[PDB]
Design a protein around this ligand. Structure first.
Ligand code: ZN
Lengths: 944, 49, 244, 215
RNA sequence: CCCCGAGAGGGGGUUUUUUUUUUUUUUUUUU
């Protein structure tokens, strides 16, 4: 039945059955039918009179424009109501800035999308949440509204009821918006809806099939390319089958690896099996991508490479485990279900081979994805000539058994190839880097003052204390002589240093870090986006900030000549740089001068200035040398990878010069005190919060990583790396130097860096104390704290330190072991994506420098194989591959000795047998050429 | 125990990481065959009060 | 981490209610006249509770007899079919249940005038037929109604309510889904007053949010008192009309 | 595990084994338990099932709970060494037995007194290489023997019989019925069961009297 | 203080045994 309440509210019974672990549970929840559900339209003049405020006393905003996109009659002005299917298929088109401006998303739709896809639902909610003056999405709770709520008719499927529910919403919207002359358009691909309208017994409704609706828009030609779309693969199993298979030990799930060297062979990592199960064949891979979580079924033993009942399959499984131990034959399997696709928006370019210039109508073409481990996709398009030489974004729709290739439809036009705009943009979004400007909800969390924000003159002022009651805990260090040593064009300053000599002979060192925590608060959208990005990526081209410009370049940035809030760490240490005591405190400072690394070094060098500031700068340098020396004695590592800096001519936007950044003594000055700051903070926050302390560890490198390096060293150069301890590894790496070539030591260092374990963030409750060890720094504990503006990890550390000293209680989100695990796993992924995008940015610009230039540069052989060699050019910092065919003449006469890593061959321009060992300095002609298949600017090198 | 009982390890998933519970072998007693209990007959005492 | 919209940006909950609205609260008096001196059948949401008041009467054992006051006993029977998943074991001797029974007794010992019924016993039997969040608050309302039906003197009403705290937001009258997704506070309010007979917090709550949560609960409990009082006068009035 | 018993380690699992009309004779003994007022030993062997049960009567003893013109009787069945039955099933037979002996025991002779009758299902072997129905007539025989051995007044020697899941207890030379029990069985087989059980009732009664006299 | 006789009589104010524990959905620093 249905009961009417006092508020005009109704209530009914929503009952459904959910199957869990082979169980049947009857779930019953009560369903309240309201009468105060807003249409959320600017035109409406009735709803604002019946609307009520939210828990936070805030009435919802009517956002749907009073003058939407006007279309040719009889559509006129109109709102768009979406179906469940059109959302799941064309979410990319729903995010396109050039279409779908005013859209109504029914509750029943939002619910179905949430259950069918988690991710798409989030993207749809973001469109609703993120609405501006360009795009406007709402959620009309039709199930909760008594006016629109429909109930299942006798003998009616749930799919037809839901379609009738959406159709009822459109009718309600249509009748409700009649006085405002705004029609509603139902975008749906469903067959069922039309029959109910063809009769048109009760009311009229304008419905267009997704494709049919697009053909009614002014910009139909610009958005038609975004419309989602004996050979036969074996059908995937039904869902019930795989769930029972996993439970009965018949089927097994894991992540599949597909190498670019072989697309016809995959391997899955299974917990029950020691060695990864191979998957041989194209039917056996079954339309699986690299990184996909797949469910595999073990093939018969006769299918093994170098059954009926479930009992025999478990016996086959045991025989498979035995065969893996014997290492004679290795078990194979076939994927029969795809648990979780690794699919994401994909960047590629149209293949000129599959597009006919003579064709004027719609034609099928192929797009070559930038991922070399991925197949090509079929695309339906009419603008095949306009997308010919451009980086395009495409999204897959389906890959069925009866099609040799996956089918995809275009999403966006990034730009032309080898252009700074298109290549940088493609570079970022391929490494999952959000570069879009901060939304309005984000920018609203910023101070109301704006750029004219200022730290209070008096820290006891009634007004200032009234607004900030924590200001009394704020220390005053504006009398100190603070200076910042950062690169030339650095506007986002994180760290600031000072030094005084205490009357007791000891030194007072203070490291001051930007007080980002004071501006970004947990829960806000600003903090949300900050955590999402994890870190700001650094390119030669641009600079994608983690926080808004107003905050990171000014308010938080420790700029000179201005009063800025900061989290300060002050030490009292002797002349031998030994810490006597350490204090943490939130303070307010004023930077005396923002030096550059070259500018700071010259000031010290001159002897020109006796000023109290410069005298302090010299003192800091003296401490740093002592501090660095202690670390080296302790067992600190000294790895190296000084990447090149793409010089840009003032005269020409295009890059022409590639130089190298030199490490000045001021770089060692800043580095030593930043490390000192991070260490002291790490010790303090862990002492205060032993279970949720944001820390950073570095695993010790396995012996297997250096066994190959020591193999090449002991064979060719007759040397070795100890690996017994970090100090032992450092000492042996240090003596690893050739007198005939000084760069040999640098080459070994930059090569022994590749075999180091990746450092990761974590929380102190996830590991034990001995696991806090940082191998590369030889410290028992460590954390990131000095760069709040460009690292969210520091922000967490700042909040934890503030709670550690008693300045302000630590937020619950930083004391939840579960929430901390999510933060760490995110910033770890964002960190990797940051460096990879950064290195890719260097790769593009350097590749553009050598675009139309050939020069004999110095090269070093780092990898020796039978198919060719790999040489590294330190001048450009680019590794190149010289194939055997282009390496020498007569490939059948060349020989490769794995024992000596020697490759003997007869050069093309000669006839004398030359033996090319490893680590050899060779002359190499550089040349760049974009591959016609991968569209990636590679550097073809020819030795001499 | 059965030579090769089909029942092997049972996979249990955590929050991201995976683990496998060790295969439990079902021990079965013989319907007929039996061995006598090895009692230290030198130690068997009898009660009196 | 909840994938469901516990509190949507539209200010709507999973069941449709807003932040501040009680759940259908339907009371029923004199439901079991041949089984008890006083009886009440409570329906607060999907919650279904039978409450029986037997007494004041002679104690079954003279050993357990007070010559200055009546003996008040409460036994809560949470049936094995109260929740979607049937519980295999009984809850009769469960520590959680013993605490509930004890709690209820300690509540009404200071409300029921036991002093005017010396050398007697008041037995309160409760049967929970269905459970869906806020069962403690519903237990309080059931006893208060049943006791009044039995004509047993008491100083005032005792209304029970539960309030959840999802993030910052406070949710009145939470159900099973909401209780599983957030910390809740159970409040017993005496009459129209600000005085609490029962304050129950079993999960973590920030110290700053607790006062506001109490404020919401007290206001909501006052509405429960009004509904109980309303239905009681209605039942009274009809009886008076028909009897007189 | 339990703080009142020694049940051993919890990880231990019980040993489970694997694979690689007919005339009835019974033995009767009374008064071998000095601990109580009356006791009986009833052993029966037939086909692929033998049973050895012991009965013990404690009373008439004091009753705390209430005043009584007549006596009060309680019967409890206990599981024996190996064979086991559901507690519910043992309670059900106990109730069925209480009804029977409340028709036989001269309760009027024992005011404010309690007669507690215990029947131990000591050894019930099932050799077939609701089974409780075949044990019921032997229980009644044991309780009757024990009560008579105790010196508790009986209106008549109550005995019983079992036939195809049907159990019926007789008194007064089989003229009347003091209890009727039926599980499973067939349809319209009442008359056949009554005759077969009365034959067992007569045989049991003769052996009981022979035991109460000669022994 | 309480009940029954018209006058210092009588009758009542309320004691003792029974049965175990779970619990909800590629290092490092500044950028
Ligand atoms: Zn409206």
């Amino acid at each position: 039945r249905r009961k009417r309440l006092a508020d005009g509210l109704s209530v009914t019974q929503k009952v459904f059955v959910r199957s869990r672990n082979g169980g049947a549970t009857k779930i019953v929840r009560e369903h309240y039918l309201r009468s105060d559900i807003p249409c959320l339209s600017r035109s409406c003049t009735k709803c604002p009179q019946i609307v009520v405020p939210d828990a936070q006393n805030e009435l919802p905003k009517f956002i749907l424009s009073d003058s939407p996109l006007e279309l040719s009659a009889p559509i006129g002005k109109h709102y768009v109501v979406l179906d469940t299917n059109v959302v799941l298929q064309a979410i990319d088109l729903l995010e396109n800035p050039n279409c779908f401006f005013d859209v109504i998303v029914p509750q029943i739709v939002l619910d179905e999308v949430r259950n069918k896809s988690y991710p798409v639902y989030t993207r749809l909610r973001t469109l609703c949440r993120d609405s501006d003056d360009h795009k406007r999405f709402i959620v009309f709770h039709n199930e909760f509204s008594e006016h629109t709520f429909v109930e299942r008719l006798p003998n009616e499927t749930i799919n037809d009821r839901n379609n009738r529910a959406i159709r009822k919403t459109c009718q309600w919207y249509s009748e409700h918006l009649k006085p405002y002359d705004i029609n509603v358009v139902l975008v749906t691909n469903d067959r069922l809806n039309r029959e109910a309208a063809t009769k048109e017994v009760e009311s009229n409704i304008i419905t267009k099939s997704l494709v049919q609706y697009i053909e009614l828009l002014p910009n139909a030609d610009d958005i038609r390319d975004s419309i989602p779309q004996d050979f036969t693969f074996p059908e995937y199993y039904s869902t019930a089958r795989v769930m029972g298979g996993l439970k009965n030990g018949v089927l097994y799930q894991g992540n599949i690896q597909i190498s670019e060297y072989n697309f016809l062979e995959g391997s899955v990592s299974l917990p029950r099996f020691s060695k990864p199960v191979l998957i041989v064949g194209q039917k056996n891979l079954n339309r699986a991508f690299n990184g996909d979580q797949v469910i595999v079924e073990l093939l018969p033993q006769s299918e093994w490479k170098a059954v009926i009942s479930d009992k025999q399959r478990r016996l086959l499984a045991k025989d498979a485990m035995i065969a893996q131990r014997s290492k004679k034959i290795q078990p194979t399997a076939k994927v029969v279900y795809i648990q979780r696709r690794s699919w994401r928006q994909y960047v590629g370019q149209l293949a000129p081979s599959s597009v006919d210039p003579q064709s004027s109508s719609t034609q099928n073409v192929f797009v070559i994805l930038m991922d070399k481990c991925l197949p090509k996709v079929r695309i339906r398009t009419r603008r095949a000539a306009e997308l010919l030489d451009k980086r395009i974004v495409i999204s897959i729709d389906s890959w069925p058994t009866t099609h040799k290739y996956p089918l995809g439809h275009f999403v966006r036009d990034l730009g032309t190839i080898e252009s700074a705009q298109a290549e940088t943009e493609a570079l970022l979004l391929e490494h999952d880097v959000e570069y879009r400007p901060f939304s309005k909800k984000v920018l609203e969390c910023l101070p109301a003052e704006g750029h004219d924000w200022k730290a209070p003159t008096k820290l006891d002022d009634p007004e200032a204390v009234s607004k900030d009651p924590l200001l009394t805990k704020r220390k005053d260090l504006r009398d100190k002589l603070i200076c910042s040593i950062d690169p030339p064009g650095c506007v986002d300053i994180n760290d600031a240093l000072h030094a005084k000599k205490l009357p007791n002979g000891n030194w007072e060192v203070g490291v001051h870090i930007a007080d980002v925590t004071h501006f970004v608060k947990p829960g806000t959208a600003l903090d949300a986006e900050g955590a999402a990005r994890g870190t700001s990526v650094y390119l030669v081209d641009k600079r994608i900030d983690m926080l808004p410009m107003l905050l990171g370049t000014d308010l938080c940035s420790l700029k000179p000549y201005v009063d800025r809030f900061a989290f300060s760490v002050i030490w009292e240490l002797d002349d031998s740089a030994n810490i006597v005591n350490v204090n943490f405190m939130k303070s307010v400072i004023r930077s005396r001068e923002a030096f550059s690394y070259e500018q700071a070094q010259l000031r010290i060098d001159d002897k020109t200035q006796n000023d109290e500031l410069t005298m302090g700068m010299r003192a800091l340098l003296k401490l740093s040398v002592k501090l660095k020396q202690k670390r080296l004695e302790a067992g600190a590592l000294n790895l190296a990878s000084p990447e090149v800096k793409v010089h840009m001519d003032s005269e020409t936007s295009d890059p022409n010069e590639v130089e190298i950044k030199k490490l000045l003594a001021t770089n060692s000055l800043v580095e030593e005190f930043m490390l000192l700051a991070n260490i002291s903070v790490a010790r303090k926050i862990y002492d205060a919060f032993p279970q949720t302390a944001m820390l950073r560890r570095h695993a010790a490198p396995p012996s297997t990583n250096f066994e190959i390096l020591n193999e090449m060293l002991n064979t060719r150069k007759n040397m070795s790396i100890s690996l017994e301890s970090s100090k032992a590894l450092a000492d042996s790496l240090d003596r690893c130097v050739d007198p005939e070539d000084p760069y040999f030591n640098t080459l070994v260092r930059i090569m022994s860096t590749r075999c180091m374990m990746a450092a990761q963030y974590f929380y102190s409750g996830a590991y034990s104390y001995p696991d806090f060890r940082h191998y590369g720094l030889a410290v028992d504990i460590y954390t990131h704290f000095t760069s709040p503006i460009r690292r969210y990890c520091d922000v967490v550390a700042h909040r934890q330190l503030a709670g550690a000293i008693g300045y302000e209680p630590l937020s619950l989100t930083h004391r939840d072991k579960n929430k901390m695990d999510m933060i760490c796993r995110n910033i770890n992924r964002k960190h990797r994506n940051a460096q990879f995008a950064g290195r890719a940015s260097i790769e593009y610009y350097v590749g553009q420098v050598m675009r139309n230039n050939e020069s004999t540069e110095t090269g070093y052989v780092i990898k020796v194989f039978n198919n060719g060699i790999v040489v590294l050019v330190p001048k450009f910092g680019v590794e190149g591959l010289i194939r055997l065919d282009n390496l020498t003449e007569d490939p059948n006469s060349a020989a490769f000795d794995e024992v000596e890593y020697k490759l003997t061959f007869v050069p093309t321009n000669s006839d004398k047998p030359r033996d090319v060992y490893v680590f050899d300095k060779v002359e190499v002609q550089v040349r760049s050429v974009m591959d016609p298949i991968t569209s990636k600017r590679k550097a073809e090198l020819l030795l001499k | 125990i059965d030579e090769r009982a089909s029942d092997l390890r049972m996979t249990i998933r955590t929050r991201g990481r995976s683990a496998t519970i060790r295969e439990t072998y079902e021990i079965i007693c013989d319907q007929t065959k039996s061995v006598p209990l090895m009692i230290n007959a030198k130690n068997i005492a009898f009660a009196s009060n | 981490m909840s994938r469901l919209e516990i509190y949507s940006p539209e200010g709507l909950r999973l069941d449709g209610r807003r932040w501040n609205e009680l759940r259908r609260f339907e009371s029923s008096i004199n439901t079991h006249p041949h089984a008890a001196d006083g009886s009440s059948y409570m329906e607060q949401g999907n919650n279904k509770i039978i409450t029986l008041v037997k007494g004041p009467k002679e104690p079954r054992l003279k050993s357990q007899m007070d010559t200055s006051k009546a003996l008040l006993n409460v036994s809560v029977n949470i049936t094995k079919f109260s929740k979607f998943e049937r519980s295999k074991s009984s809850h009769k001797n469960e520590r959680r249940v013993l605490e509930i029974q004890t709690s209820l007794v300690r509540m009404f010992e200071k409300n029921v005038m036991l002093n005017i019924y010396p050398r007697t016993v008041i037995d309160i039997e409760i049967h929970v037929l269905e459970q869906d969040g806020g069962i403690m608050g519903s237990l309080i309302n059931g006893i208060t109604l049943a006791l009044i039906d039995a004509g047993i003197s008491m100083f005032d009403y005792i209304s029970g309510i539960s309030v959840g705290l999802y993030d910052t937001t406070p949710l009145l009258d939470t159900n099973s889904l909401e209780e599983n997704a957030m910390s809740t506070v159970t409040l017993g309010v005496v009459g129209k007053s600000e005085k609490l007979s029962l304050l129950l917090v079993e999960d973590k709550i920030p110290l700053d949010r607790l006062e506001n949560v109490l404020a919401i609960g007290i206001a909501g409990a006052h509405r429960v008192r009004d509904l109980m009082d309303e239905e009681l006068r209605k039942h009274a009035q009809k009886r008076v009309s028909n009897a007189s | 595990q339990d703080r009142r018993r020694l049940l051993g380690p919890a990880a231990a699992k019980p040993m489970a084994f694997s694979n690689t009309e007919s005339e009835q004779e019974l033995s009767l003994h009374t008064g071998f338990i000095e601990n109580c007022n009356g006791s009986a030993l009833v052993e029966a062997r037939s086909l692929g099932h033998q049973t050895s049960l012991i009965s013990a009567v404690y009373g008439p003893r004091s009753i705390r709970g209430s005043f009584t013109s007549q006596g009060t009787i309680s019967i409890q069945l206990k599981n024996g060494l190996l064979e086991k039955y559901n507690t519910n099933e043992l309670k059900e037979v106990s109730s069925f037995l209480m009804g029977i002996f409340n028709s036989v025991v001269n309760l009027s002779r024992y005011p404010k007194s309690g007669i507690d009758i215990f029947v131990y299902l000591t050894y019930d072997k099932d050799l077939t290489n609701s089974q409780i129905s075949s044990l019921i007539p032997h229980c009644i025989t044991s309780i009757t023997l024990a009560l008579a051995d105790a010196g508790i007044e009986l209106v008549d020697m109550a005995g019983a019989g079992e036939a195809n899941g049907t159990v019926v207890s007789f008194i007064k030379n089989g003229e009347e019925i003091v209890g009727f029990w039926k599980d499973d069985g067939d349809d319209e087989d009442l008359l056949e069961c009554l005759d077969r059980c009365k034959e067992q009732y007569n045989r049991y009664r003769d052996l009981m009297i022979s035991c109460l006299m000669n022994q």
